[PDB]
Amino acid sequence: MADLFNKHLKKATNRTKEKLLEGIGKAKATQDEVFDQHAANLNKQSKSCEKLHKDVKNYSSALRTLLSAEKQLRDTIRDAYEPEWPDREHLTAIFDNLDIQTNELEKTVCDDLPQTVTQYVNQFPDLKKKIEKRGRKLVDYDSAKNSFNSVKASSKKDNDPKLAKATMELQAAEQMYTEMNNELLEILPAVFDSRITFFVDTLQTLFNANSVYQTDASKFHKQIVMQLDKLGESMDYL
Amino acid sequence: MADLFNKHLKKATNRTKEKLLEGIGKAKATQDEVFDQHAANLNKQSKSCEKLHKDVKNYSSALRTLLSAEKQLRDTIRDAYEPEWPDREHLTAIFDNLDIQTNELEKTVCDDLPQTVTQYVNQFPDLKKKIEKRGRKLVDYDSAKNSFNSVKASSKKDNDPKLAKATMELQAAEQMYTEMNNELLEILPAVFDSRITFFVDTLQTLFNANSVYQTDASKFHKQIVMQLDKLGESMDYL
Amino acid sequence: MADLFNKHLKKATNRTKEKLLEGIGKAKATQDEVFDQHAANLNKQSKSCEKLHKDVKNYSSALRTLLSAEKQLRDTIRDAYEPEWPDREHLTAIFDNLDIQTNELEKTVCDDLPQTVTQYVNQFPDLKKKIEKRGRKLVDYDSAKNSFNSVKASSKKDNDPKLAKATMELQAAEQMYTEMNNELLEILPAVFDSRITFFVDTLQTLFNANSVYQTDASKFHKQIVMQLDKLGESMDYL
Amino acid sequence: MADLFNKHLKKATNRTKEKLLEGIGKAKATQDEVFDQHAANLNKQSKSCEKLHKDVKNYSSALRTLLSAEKQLRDTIRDAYEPEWPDREHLTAIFDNLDIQTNELEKTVCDDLPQTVTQYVNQFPDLKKKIEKRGRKLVDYDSAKNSFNSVKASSKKDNDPKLAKATMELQAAEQMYTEMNNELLEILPAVFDSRITFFVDTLQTLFNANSVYQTDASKFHKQIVMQLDKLGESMDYL
């Protein structure tokens, strides 16, 4: 069977090459070579951002409730503690310090963090737009260039004002093309590579705030462990 | 002027004073007056337990939910991560260890902690009942004592079955009174002071588990801070 | 039942302590400590007097009729006696002497006795009034003392003429307070203890008059007994 | 002049003088003339008894009321007394003894005394009637005596049934006359003089009872005078 069905194989592979003509659309001379690669690069910067933002916002709400629950924990232990027992003031001050630390983390992650994306995303819109800016005259340059030759090929004489018009289009499109090459060839790919800059600022902000809080939380909770040890000794007398 | 109407309240309220006092009882130098310490005092131990238990159960659910949310945090970072960043394996292992530590805390507090209260509490239920085991035996002992005297005073001849019966009650009640005194004056006061034993075992179980988790969490999260530092260095190349 | 109904016992005794707030009235800083005890003492002098007077007046009327009936007895025996019989003049003079003795007792108890209460009750009104005299400035002294401190506590400066006013009240009330302490601390309790003085004067007057009469009456009636003995001897001859 | 009208009164009044004298009777040397002592004389004994009885009954009620008022005196002092005075028990016993003495007097005079009159009085009622037992027998005796003579004078022959009848009346009346003389001349005069026997028994009963009471009353009340003296000493401390 496999070879007879290989008539299916033979048909499929080479005849599919003709099918690719039908797949794409109506013109083929384009900005693709240099600047679609830069376009895809600058879009690859955007496409991770939207996921990161969704997760960062949802989890920032999760952190805001988490810190609120840790504030409730502290107030509840303060209030549940009662003055018959040895140390209430010291552990109360520990809880107040951990409240301060939760408020720092809450401010920094929940409120402040999103700006750290913006901190370098500021520029990316105009630059995304500018990939298209370069493209406009990468297309019109070739169109004008060929058009000039076209006229010089079609007319019995130069005098055919169309040759002048196509020259004017060629000059204008080449001027824009070259200016936009210089600006955009550096900036747009540099901005893709710099996409890591805003990712790193944001992730660093988020984790730095979390880690400073938990670093303080561990010493504060180890201090309450020492409060357990003295409470063991206290255990018989009270 | 209104005080004249208070004269009417005086007549009625003086008769209630008598009837309240009829509530009280009869005795000789009785250590049951220390059992008039026990009942309201071993009830501090009960009523503070009900508050402690209530809070500990509510907050044990709160801790279970917190540890679940921390499992979700880890799984979310682990899943959110991309293979193009090298520490993905190291920080995945850091998160796996912190998952283990949350599971240990969750088991220890949320599941296990109530038994710690129970361990010293097990003796208290019988011993509270024992407060009345002793207390009634005073009422019988001095009732029988004064009954024997009452017969010997009332009865014209002695040779009175009432006197023999009152002697039998006196002996029986005195034996129970003295047995219960010896047992209960040791045990029941000891249970009051020893109430601190379950309070301390319970509080120690709860805070010990929380501290071992957070001590491990701080080292594990400091190791993710070091991952931020290497990511800052990485930031520019990627 | 008794312990469940002891929920009634438990409720009644401690919750009654809160009920005592509702029982009394609107201020608590007062003359009670030193001088209500002296006030009750000087009132305890009055409260036996009114009963004693009621009974002494009613029985003084009873004595006035009793002595009148004894006068009728004497006149009737004098008049019933007749001159055929041996001794009429001697027993007639006995009756006349017992008339004199009844008139002495009648004067002394029925007419004169009440003044023997007054003999020392003279002073008690003003002194009863004076317990209140002391009280007026035992109250206003504290009120002025506290008021001075109040002003010195409330005003931003001394200059607040209220401080002067409260000083003037304090001085005046302390002057009256001390004067009234000196007079009243001795007199009012001494007057309670001296209440026995007028009781004893009155009871002595009453009984002394009665006993002098009956002492004479017994010798007078024993003399008429000797008249019976001679009348036995007379019995045959007449 | 008015004396002339007295002549008219003389004629009528002289005829009444005759008719009064027709009231009188007939006799020989009769000891019934001493029975003309008895009737008006044993009536002194009756009429003075009625006065004595009247007064004794009225005054026995008066004594009953007096002794009742003295019971009330004692019970009133006993009840009026206060436990803070020591002789309350001694003077209570003094009053209890004087209650006994009033009850003894009350029984003896008020209830018992009339029988004392009665004891000697019992013989008098029959003996008063006996005065007429004798008196009529004179009227029969001399009527029959003079009747026998009258027949012997009037009757022509003797042999007269009237003379025999008059002899029978004379004998019968003389026997009764002489029997009654012997009995009644002894007894009835003796009863007149012996009237003093019940007067003396009665007066002695009355005054003896009154004196024994008052003799005891004076010692008992002198013992309350001693209670006044100890109360004078007590007076200052109480």
CATH number of the domain at D49, please.
1.20.1270.60
How was this entry determined?
A: cryo-EM
Instruction: Report the Cα C146 to chain-centroid distance in Å.
Output: 40
Structure tokens at B139: 């009422």
Contact B9 C16 (CB under 8 A): no
Q: Which residues contact D27 (CB under 8 A, 6 or more apart)?
A: D33, D138, D142
Sign of CA dihedral C119, C125, C128, C133: negative
**A59 lies in a domain?**
yes
- How many Å apart are CA C72 and CA C19, to the nearest integer? 66
Contact A231 B203 (CB under 8 A): yes
Phi, psi of B83 (to 5 degrees): -65, -10
Q: Report the residue numbers after which chain B has a gap, meaning the C atom sits over 2.5 angstroms from the next written residue's N, or none.
A: none
- How many Å apart are CA A232 and CA A182, to the nearest integer? 75
Chains contacting chain C through 3 or more C-beta pairs under 8 A: B, D
Q: Give the count of domains, chain B.
A: 1
- How many Å apart are CA B189 and CA B38, to the nearest integer? 7
Structure tokens at A34: 């240099």
Contact B222 A210 (CB under 8 A): no
Structure tokens at C228: 């019976």
**Which one, of D226, D161, B230, C54, lies nearest residue A207 by Cα?**
B230
Phi, psi of C28 (to 5 degrees): -130, -10
Q: Which residue matches tokens 């023997």?
A: C116
Burial class (CB in 10 A: 0-12, 13-18, 19+), D202: buried
Closest CA–CA distance from residue B23 to any residue of chain C (Å): 7
C-chain residues near D193 (CB < 8 A): 236, 238
Element (H, E) at D199: helix D161-237
**D180 lies in a domain?**
yes
B-chain residues near C25 (CB < 8 A): 3
| A100 φψ region: left (φ > 0), alpha (ψ -120 to 50), beta (else) | alpha
**Which one, of A212, A222, A225, A221, lies nearest residue A102 by Cα?**
A212
Closest CA–CA distance from residue B184 to any residue of chain A (Å): 19
Q: Which residues contact B232 (CB under 8 A, 6 or more apart)?
A: A200, A204
Chains D and C touch each other (3 or more Cβ pairs < 8 A): yes
B-chain residues near A210 (CB < 8 A): 221
What proportions of chain D, in percent to the nearest 5, are helix, strand and coil?
90, 0, 10
Chains A and C touch each other (3 or more Cβ pairs < 8 A): no
Is B107 in CB contact (< 8 Å) with chain A?
A: no
Is B23 in CB contact (< 8 Å) with chain C?
A: yes
**Which one, of C57, C196, C207, lies nearest residue D85 by Cα?**
C196
Instruction: Count Cβ–Cβ pairs < 8 Å, chain A vs chain B.
Output: 90
Angle between helices C6-24 and B2-21 (to 10 degrees): 160
Is A221 in CB contact (< 8 Å) with chain B?
A: yes
Q: Which residues contact D69 (CB under 8 A, 6 or more apart)?
A: C62, C66
Is B155 in CB contact (< 8 Å) with chain A?
A: no
Is C207 in CB contact (< 8 Å) with chain D?
A: yes
**Which one, of B65, B202, B190, lies nearest residue A80 by Cα?**
B202
3-state class of B155 per DSSP? Answer: coil
- For B:33-62, CB contacts with A below 8 A are 51-52, 55, 59, 62
- How many Å apart are CA C181 and CA C138, to the nearest integer? 9
**B128 lies in a domain?**
yes
Report yes or no: C177 and C145 within 8 Å, Cβ to Cβ. no
Residues of C15-34 as b/e, b for ≥16 C-beta within 10 angstroms? eeeeeeeeeeeeeeeebeee
- How many Å apart are CA A70 and CA B210, to the nearest integer? 13
Chains B and C touch each other (3 or more Cβ pairs < 8 A): yes
**Which one, of B28, B23, B20, B112, lies nearest residue B63 by Cα?**
B112
Q: Which residues contact B235 (CB under 8 A, 6 or more apart)?
A: A196, A197, A199, A200
Is B215 in CB contact (< 8 Å) with chain A?
A: yes
**D164 lies in a domain?**
yes
Is A225 in CB contact (< 8 Å) with chain B?
A: yes
Chains contacting chain A through 3 or more C-beta pairs under 8 A: B
Is B9 in CB contact (< 8 Å) with chain C?
A: yes
Contact A203 B231 (CB under 8 A): yes
Task: Compute the residue count for chain B.
Answer: 238
Is C23 in CB contact (< 8 Å) with chain B?
A: yes
- How many Å apart are CA D74 and CA A27, to the nearest integer? 148
- How many Å apart are CA B107 and CA B111, to the nearest integer? 5
- How many Å apart are CA C116 and CA D173, to the nearest integer? 83
**Which one, of B115, B116, B120, B131, lies nearest residue B43 by Cα?**
B131
**A33 lies in a domain?**
no
What does the CA dihedral A83, A85, A90, A92 come to, rounded to 10 degrees? -50
Any alpha helices (H) in chain A, and if so which ranges? 6-24, 37-80, 88-105, 113-121, 124-154, 162-193, 195-237
Report yes or no: D214 and D105 within 8 Å, Cβ to Cβ. no
Residue of chain B nearest C14, judged by CA positions = B20
HEC per residue, chain C? CCCCCHHHHHHHHHHHHHHHHHHHCCCCCCCHHHHHHHHHHHHHHHHHHHHHHHHHHHHHHHHHHHHHHHHHHHHHHHHHCCCCCCCHHHHHHHHHHHHHHHHHHHHHHHHHHHHHHHHHHCCHHHHHHHHHHHHHHHHHHHHHHHHHHHHHHHCCCCCCCHHHHHHHHHHHHHHHHHHHHHHHHHHHHHHHHCHHHHHHHHHHHHHHHHHHHHHHHHHHHHHHHHHHHHHHHHHHHC
3-state class of D105 per DSSP? Answer: helix
- How many Å apart are CA C97 and CA D197, to the nearest integer? 30
Instruction: Report the Cα A186 to chain-centroid distance in Å.
Output: 20
**A85 lies in a domain?**
yes
Structure tokens at A178: 């070259």
Report yes or no: C91 and C59 within 8 Å, Cβ to Cβ. no
Instruction: Count Cβ–Cβ pairs < 8 Å, chain B vs chain C.
Output: 11
Is B208 in CB contact (< 8 Å) with chain A?
A: yes
- How many Å apart are CA C187 and CA B221, to the nearest integer? 88
Closest CA–CA distance from residue D27 to any residue of chain C (Å): 31
- How many Å apart are CA C203 and CA C113, to the nearest integer? 9
Range of the domain at C184: 53-237
Q: Which residue matches tokens 């055929």?
A: C84
Burial class (CB in 10 A: 0-12, 13-18, 19+), C191: buried
Structure tokens at A187: 């900036």
Closest CA–CA distance from residue C52 to any residue of chain B (Å): 25
Q: Which residues contact C107 (CB under 8 A, 6 or more apart)?
A: none
B55, B200, B217 ranked by CB distance to A235: nearest: B200
**B101 lies in a domain?**
yes
Structure tokens at C238: 């007449």
- How many Å apart are CA C91 and CA A211, to the nearest integer? 133
- How many Å apart are CA C231 and CA D200, to the nearest integer? 7
Element (H, E) at D106: none
C-chain residues near D120 (CB < 8 A): none
Burial class (CB in 10 A: 0-12, 13-18, 19+), A81: middle
Contact A217 B221 (CB under 8 A): no
Neighbours of C225 (CB within 10 A): 16
Residue C123 vs residues C126, C131, C188: alpha-carbon distances, Å: 6, 13, 10
Angle between helices D123-154 and D113-121 (to 10 degrees): 20
- How many Å apart are CA D171 and CA D180, to the nearest integer? 14
B6, B9, B20 ranked by CB distance to C13: nearest: B20
- How many Å apart are CA A210 and CA B228, to the nearest integer? 12
**C89 lies in a domain?**
yes
Is C21 in CB contact (< 8 Å) with chain D?
A: no
- How many Å apart are CA C124 and CA C111, to the nearest integer? 23
